[PDB]
Amino acid sequence: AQRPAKYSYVDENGETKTWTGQGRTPAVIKKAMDEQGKSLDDFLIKQ
């Protein structure tokens, strides 16, 4: 608990849908790969 699941991303809404729960793959990762990793580190918000 009290730890990041794996990563996060936005798509349907401006809010983070999150990878776990019901994100998995293939999903938003398609667009990320299409734009050539436009959110590699940005997935987990801003460092």
Curated annotation (Swiss-Prot):
Residues 22-27 bind DNA. Changing residue 23 to D: Derepression of proV expression, decreased DNA-binding but still prefers curved DNA, increased oligomerization. It is found in: Cytoplasm, Nucleoid. Residues 2-47 are annotated as: Required for DNA-binding. Changing residue 1 to T: Derepression of proV expression. Changing residue 6 to Q: Does not affect hydroxyisobutyrylation. 2-hydroxyisobutyrylated by TmcA on Lys-31. Cells (strain MRE-600) in mid-exponential phase have three 15.5 kDa proteins with 3 different isoelectric points; the major form (H1a, pI 7.5) rises in concentration during growth while the 2 minor forms (H1b, pI about 7.2 and H1c, pI 7.0) remain approximately constant. Disruption phenotype: Decreased growth below 30 degrees Celsius. Altered expression of a number of genes. Derepression of the cryptic blg operon. Alteration of chromosome organization. Double hns-stpA mutants grow slower and have reduced viable cell counts compared to single hns mutants in MC1029 and MC4100 backgrounds. In 0.3M NaCl a double hns-stpA deletion up-regulates 583 and down-regulates 86 genes, 363 of which are thought to have been horizontally acquired; 131 are also up-regulated in a double cnu-hha deletion. At 28 degrees Celsius csgD transcription is reduced. Disulfide bonds: none annotated. The modification N6-(2-hydroxyisobutyryl)lysine is found at residue 31. It comes from the Bacteria. Changing residue 4 to L/S: Derepression of proV expression. Induction: Protein levels rise from about 4,000/cell in exponential phase to about 18,000/cell in late stationary phase (at protein level). Subject to transcriptional auto-repression. Induced by increased hydrostatic pressure. hns transcription can be repressed by overexpressed StpA (which is usually repressed by hns). Induced by cold shock (42 to 15 degrees Celsius) (at protein level). Changing residue 20 to A: Partial loss of repressor function. Homodimer, also found as tetramers or higher oligomers. Oligomerizes into higher-order complexes that form bridges between adjacent DNA helices. The N-terminal region (residues 1-64) can interact with overexpressed StpA. Forms a complex with Cnu (YdgT). The H-NS dimer forms a heterotrimeric complex with Hha in the absence of DNA; this is mediated by residues 1-46. Interacts with Hfq. A central region (about residues 21-47) is involved in dimerization, but multimerization requires other residues. The dimerization domain (1-47) also acts as a hinge; changes in its structure probably impact oligomerization and DNA-binding geometries. The N-terminus also interacts with Hha, perhaps via residues 2-18; a well-folded dimer is not necessary for Hha binding. The C-terminus (residues 92-137) binds DNA. Residues in the N-terminus contribute to DNA-binding and to discrimination between curved and non-curved DNA. Belongs to the histone-like protein H-NS family. A DNA-binding protein implicated in transcriptional repression (silencing). Also involved in bacterial chromosome organization and compaction. H-NS binds tightly to AT-rich dsDNA and inhibits transcription. Binds upstream and downstream of initiating RNA polymerase, trapping it in a loop and preventing transcription. Binds to hundreds of sites, approximately half its binding sites are in non-coding DNA, which only accounts for about 10% of the genome. This is DNA-binding protein H-NS. It comes from Escherichia coli (strain K12). The chain holds residues 91 to 137 of 137 of the full protein.
